[PDB]
């Protein structure tokens, strides 16, 4: 690996569909179809909000584990996930995570109704809250830009994707990857992201590798059971090292984008190698509304849908089967609410 020098793009503040916007949309699709990644050159305001988000993450992770473990909720999947790095000998590597989902109080009608995954973020403090929320506001504006450009690049109506993302279930993994335990550390294995669009930032430590599309290489459809992408191609070339570069957000298509484009776009496989020092990163998911359904754009004859809320809920239930959030959902039969949603 460590060969390629990826391009960075500036996005316009607004995307209207002029010729330059269409061209940019073409460049975005081509970057994904060739490199699996699209780097956007952020401005000083975008980059100040990234840095303060990282600073809040660093200060929080220095808190004692007892406090950090208290930042959990039984209504939402937002909050702390321990890495287990202190006792990880002979076991896989995991990052230390704080998840930020839509921050909804117990006064919100969806929470009162008992909808799965709806609840308030257990913020460790309000400075952390403000940093993450204003970070994610800027990330969401870029997500909207990118979704309009994507439609333009496929010659679709400019609002094809953004029609699904009003009050979208946007969420973010605030990540700290521990230092390697030895030169033989495996790191976090190959995987694809389950969502629509991923915008990621990282510090200067480095460790993310991604797999570009490979001609003649069949990709699993990770949103289906029996076709998991976990670990696939991890030991096969090529993997592109996502070199840390100041003032850059990296953008990848997720499983949902692969589904909606029928494989014209592929969910970019990721793997993370642990470095000699801790590595801080943020992975922002720009998602459809919890009540929105993805659908195949180019198969007008296949009446197949992926209800996003059910997709998210089933995803986090299976990744955290023992978390209090998952327990409460089963205890109070909160999935019954999803069946009502799906029968619109």
CA–CA distance, 214 with 211 (Å, rounded to integer): 8
For residue 124, what are the contacts with CB-CB under 8 A and spacing of at least 6?
60, 63, 67, 68, 71, 98
- Please count the other Cβ atoms lying within 10 Å of the Cβ belonging to residue 92: 10
Question: Which one, of 85, 120, 66, lies nearest residue 325 by Cα?
Answer: 120
**What Å resolution does this PDB entry report?**
2.1
Q: Residue 64 CB: number of other CB atoms within 10 A?
A: 8
Q: What's CA 144's distance to the chain center, in Å?
A: 15
Residue ranges of domains in the chain: 1-344
Tokens at residue 121, please? 């973020």
Beta bridge partners of 240: 210
Cα 57 to Cα 172: distance, rounded to the nearest angstrom: 12
Q: Is 270 annotated as a binding residue?
A: yes
- Per DSSP (E only), the strands in the chain are 8-9, 38-41, 79-81, 96-100, 171-177, 188-191, 197-202, 208-210, 240-241, 248-253, 270-272, 279-286, 293-294, 306-307
Task: Tell me the HSE value of 282 on the side-chain side, using a 13 A CA sphere.
Answer: 27
- Going by C-beta distance under 8 Å and a sequence separation of 6 or more, which residues neighbour residue 263? 219
**Secondary structure, 3-state, 77-116:** CCEEECCCHHHCCCCCCCCEEEEECCECCCCCHHHHHCCC
What is the experimental method?
X-ray
Residue 333, exposed/middle/buried by CB under 10 A (0-12, 13-18, 19+)?
exposed
Q: Is residue 235 a known part of a binding site?
A: no
User: Containing H/E element for 152?
Assistant: helix 126-153
């Amino acid at each position: 690996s460590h060969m390629t020098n990826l391009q960075t793009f500036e996005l316009p503040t607004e995307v209207t569909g002029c010729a330059a916007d269409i061209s940019l949309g073409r460049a975005l699709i081509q970057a994904w179809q060739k490199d699996g990644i699209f780097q956007i050159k952020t401005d000083s305001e975008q980059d100040r909000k990234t840095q303060e988000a990282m600073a809040a993450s660093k200060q929080f992770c220095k808190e004692p584990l007892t406090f950090k473990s208290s930042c959990v909720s039984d209504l939402t999947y937002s909050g702390y996930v321990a890495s287990g790095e202190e006792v990880t000998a002979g076991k896989p590597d995991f990052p230390e995570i704080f998840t930020v989902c839509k921050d909804l109080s117990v006064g919100d009608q969806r929470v009162k109704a008992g909808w799965p995954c709806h609840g308030p973020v257990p913020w460790p403090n309000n400075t952390y809250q403000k940093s993450m929320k204003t970070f994610m506001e800027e990330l969401g504006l870029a997500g909207e830009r990118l979704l309009k450009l994507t439609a333009l690049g496929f010659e679709l109506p400019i609002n094809t994707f953004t029609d699904l993302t009003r009050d979208g279930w946007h969420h973010m993994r605030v990540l700290r990857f521990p230092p390697q335990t030895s030169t033989l550390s495996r790191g976090i294995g190959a995987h694809t992201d389950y969502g629509l669009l991923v915008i990621a930032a990282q510090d200067d430590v480095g460790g993310l590798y991604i797999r570009p599309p490979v001609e003649g290489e069949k990709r699993n459809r990770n949103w289906l059971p029996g076709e998991s992408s976990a670990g696939m191609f991890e030991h096969d070339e090529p993997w592109t090292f996502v070199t840390p570069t100041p003032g850059v957000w990296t953008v990848f298509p997720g499983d949902i984008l692969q589904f909606m484009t029928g494989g014209q776009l592929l969910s970019t496989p990721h793997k993370v190698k642990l470095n000699t020092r801790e590595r801080f990163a943020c992975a922002y998911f720009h998602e459809p509304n919890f009540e929105a359904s993805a659908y195949p754009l180019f198969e007008p004859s296949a009446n197949e849908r992926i209800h996003y809320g059910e997709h998210f809920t089933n995803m986090f239930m299976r990744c955290y089967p023992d978390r209090i959030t998952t327990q409460r959902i089963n205890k109070e039969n909160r999935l019954a609410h999803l069946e009502d949603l799906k029968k619109y």
